[PDB]
Structure 1
């Protein structure tokens, strides 16, 4: 019994490496070269890996895990019993795989065109418009156009996707796909824990929201901003209003304390995408963590190709499951935002390398939020004015409370603004999956949540046939999103603990853990566990305690919360959006 199970897990691990490596290659080739051929080979490799999954998943289900002594072998076998889509009948599996590829392709090639004029892709063109335009009408053209071309085109696929992904989840013992996704956290109290964390961050978000709304009222006019209502969703510098830092110029608390133009500085100094990832590599190795192998530099696609290839430009990090081939694919733009993204992606690579000696079944983060947090932790240190100054991308900003509040505001526009967004994406999808939201009400329930959690409203009334969730990458690509909410909270807990381990004193937001070997050792021991143990053990290794907690993030931003409360009180802001029914008149 126990001996049969141990031999089984060894066989699974040997054959999975080979098959998973092959699948990763075909997926990479399509992702970096979208063609009918590569897409045909990908769909073919899909059926190959499903045959492997079905073979070993069927065997695994014949072990009564109850009678197993070893708990690492229990854990592997329990996971292999979940076939995911390979539980579907052959006909439905083929249809499911084609739906997913159609949704992804539709999103990745959509464009927004002027009549008799040029056509813009999402990256970099429309992203640039949303980030830099300060004209209501031009922002509206891009915001609405993307949803008209991308979102509306996904709607035809989504109901059938939902049916098929739920059917697979039921065939694997879950009640629906959202149940399956939540189970990745192995945390029965997950929904209540996440709701508690969201509530703890509400005071900070409402004060930020009210301050930004006042600043938008100053620039865009009283006729277009209701100081007691939701904010129009196209004015926040980002296609999804998920991060707001690109409108820093409109909301700067102390314009008398200016910051160097970081994009001009990178360009003037000859930064390139390759330099951006090299600086990330240096930060990781400064902590005593691992460098990326030479192969990484040869096989990664670090900028939009120019040879006519259509590619999936959305950034991603790749494990090829042979312990040696790791890659990034990013249509990198030379700016500070993409430097942070490069650190994020390099954090996924670091995790891949740290757990590469585990059985492939356990080669995942302690939970998906952990995988997302590693690179962001380092990026918190990289983002400090003192570190950016040492890269020659800022002037000296120390010894100045004005510069200090400006910096906290810059960070808040990204980190705090993102909290409600990241919460609501899977609040919506979980209710789509459990049947609470039907295709009749997809879009209406999306905007009810955009209002309830982010206090945003659409600048143009939505009409039948709109499917604005489809205009957000992770929806047609079927990537769960709550990982990013968890990540944004726990990355501050990790930062706090690593700064304490590095001997930092004083305000948490001034800490920079560059070159701390004690910090790197905490992260390395946690990452090496992969998915071999419940995630509270990895939490304990990093922070000395087992819980998720908003306290670290609230401590980081405490000086800004104090300042915002004073400023909002002085101006008589009404926090929140009691006039929640308001929408733009024109």
Structure 2
């Protein structure tokens, strides 16, 4: 066991250099797309391959079940996962071969009009989904993308499942479904997730029905059955996972602005650094670690002008060197990016306060936490109080409706995104379970689309199609249930901070600002990183060891009432018992 002690020491000492090297190129390329940087990156990819496999094979020689230093126990258990590397080289070779074929297929698939005009998934087709109100063109866009991109993925999916299942078993899991579900470190996950979902049903069903009514007056009864599920191609998003694009058709109250925050930010001279600077101020008032000085010289807060090409997905980066932390965002001076900024700083704040752990535990308490902390520090930003506190809005009449408008806009993503994020990983889990096969992939997908989102496809579909290929995270083999965890637990934290900050009354009016205790309440939680089962941190924050939806239901309580009330004014019937209806041709 003393050698096990030494082993973890060398692992850190070597791994820091390998990941920092990896990050150094990985950052350099994400900002500097120059082709040779990719070559440099790929060799570094070999090193992490060398490193991951070298120390992983050694890690499997220790028997963890006899160890009693708790830190080493979790460290070794993590490292023993060889993931792809447990596969035979031939199949590992075969596995990577398949991944790129899938990734390539999706990466170059496009929908072309009959004249040969070709539109790409982003931003081109996404603009269509967001902006068109033409039943015909939306259907064409949704149907087309699923026809060229979706159908083609059946060229690889079956063997892909078999292979990652083979890998998962060789890493000690029952199947790939077991492998991912294990990272929430809690065996009853699905049971917990199931209950969590049911507790949102009263809210979600009310919201669902109200959106349906909105669709009803724009698409008409010929395409909208007020008594059935909603056509899944109208939710304003290619996958209908986020419904915020239709807010204009769904807003409960016009006269929403007291001012245009975009125009306001311009008037006050807001700049990307100033925006992020305001975030640091909010973060500083919360007593968290101030950002390290090198950050302000190496982050990239604006679109570069030196002809470098950038991968513009905003995200946060840690170089595992206790000094280099960076944010990469094509920052536009508007309220949207202001939330993005606080979200990104949320990750950075999280990185800084677990910097004291060895690399092997430099992760969130669970995959959700890292993506959950990202929101909480941002939530207050868009509340009317905080929006006003920075004069982003001049004084407005104190209507609840403006609260309601904000809450719905929030719900139209926070809520709608829940069931979709649930369904994907359930569909995959049962496919990894072998309980679902290709012969009915499509039926299991849509059946879950019905049960969980209250959706049915716009037109009938038979085999030869494989609709799930239409969502990036599937062919890219990336899990989703973390996002579900993020959109639940973030409300527990918000309640906990508001409770600790002493705020009373409607929860959405709470503002963390300057709460010297509230910040420390999170701080002690964050420093645990990934060394502990997330229940310890969850308790340390909120006072409970389980995930609870109740915080969320209370947060949206006012919107529920107004939406629920609206259902009565229109007599809207909740649910979708009449499963089979679709828009008329």
- Taking the aligned partners of 1:432 and 1:305, their CA distance within structure 2 comes to 43
How big is the shift at 1:268?
A: 7.1
How big is the shift at 1:154?
A: 4.0
Change (3 A) 1:18 1:526: same
How big is the shift at 1:223?
A: 1.5
Q: Deviations over 1:191-230 (max 9, x none)?
A: 1011010001100000000011101111222222111122
Q: Secondary structure of the equivalent of 1:28?
A: helix
- Taking the aligned partners of 1:315 and 1:105, their CA distance within structure 2 comes to 23
- Which has the higher mean CA deviation after the structures are superposed, 341-350 or 93-102? 93-102
How big is the shift at 1:402?
A: 2.5
Change (3 A) 1:397 1:430: farther
Change (3 A) 1:352 1:463: farther
- Taking the aligned partners of 2:219 and 2:306, their CA distance within structure 1 comes to 41
Contact 2:59 2:76 in 1 (8 A): yes
Change (3 A) 1:145 1:350: farther
Contact 2:235 2:242 in 1 (8 A): yes
Change (3 A) 1:169 1:294: same
Contact 1:13 1:361 in 2 (8 A): yes
Change (3 A) 1:186 1:101: same
How big is the shift at 1:325?
A: 2.6
- Taking the aligned partners of 2:97 and 2:293, their CA distance within structure 1 comes to 35
How big is the shift at 1:391?
A: 4.4
Change (3 A) 1:308 1:162: farther
- Which has the higher mean CA deviation after the structures are superposed, 12-21 or 452-461? 452-461
Contact 2:223 2:582 in 1 (8 A): no
How big is the shift at 1:487?
A: 1.1
Change (3 A) 1:359 1:400: same
How big is the shift at 1:116?
A: 5.9
Return the TM-score normalized by structure 1: 0.91
- Which has the higher mean CA deviation after the structures are superposed, 353-362 or 152-161? 152-161
Contact 1:43 1:98 in 2 (8 A): no
Change (3 A) 1:23 1:520: same
How big is the shift at 1:406?
A: 2.3
- Taking the aligned partners of 1:274 and 1:71, their CA distance within structure 2 comes to 42
Contact 2:258 2:395 in 1 (8 A): no
Change (3 A) 1:225 1:332: farther
Q: Deviations over 1:239-273 (max 9, x none)?
A: 32222223222112222555655556556777565
Change (3 A) 1:537 1:138: same
Aligned match of 1:243: 242
Contact 2:439 2:463 in 1 (8 A): no
Aligned match of 2:539: 540
How big is the shift at 1:274?
A: 5.1
Return the TM-score normalized by structure 2: 0.91
Contact 1:123 1:313 in 2 (8 A): no
Change (3 A) 1:190 1:420: same
Q: Secondary structure of the equivalent of 1:155?
A: helix
How many pairs does the alignment contain?
Answer: 585
Aligned match of 1:3: 2
Contact 2:422 2:481 in 1 (8 A): yes
Question: Residues 514-533 of structure 1 correspond to what in structure 2 (within 5 A)?
Answer: 514-533=513-532
Change (3 A) 1:179 1:551: same
Aligned match of 1:465: 464
Query: Which ranges of structure 1 fall in alignment gaps of 5 or more residues?
Result: none
- Which has the higher mean CA deviation after the structures are superposed, 381-390 or 209-218? 381-390
- Taking the aligned partners of 1:116 and 1:268, their CA distance within structure 2 comes to 46
Contact 2:368 2:486 in 1 (8 A): yes
How big is the shift at 1:106?
A: 4.8
Change (3 A) 1:180 1:405: same
- Taking the aligned partners of 1:462 and 1:29, their CA distance within structure 2 comes to 45
How big is the shift at 1:121?
A: 4.2
Q: Secondary structure of the equivalent of 2:327?
A: strand
Change (3 A) 1:402 1:316: closer
How big is the shift at 1:136?
A: 2.9
Change (3 A) 1:36 1:257: closer
Q: Deviations over 1:264-319 (max 9, x none)?
A: 65567775655554443433233122344454455445566678877654443332
- Which has the higher mean CA deviation after the structures are superposed, 219-228 or 457-466? 457-466
Change (3 A) 1:397 1:192: farther
Change (3 A) 1:121 1:18: same
- Which has the higher mean CA deviation after the structures are superposed, 452-461 or 168-177? 452-461
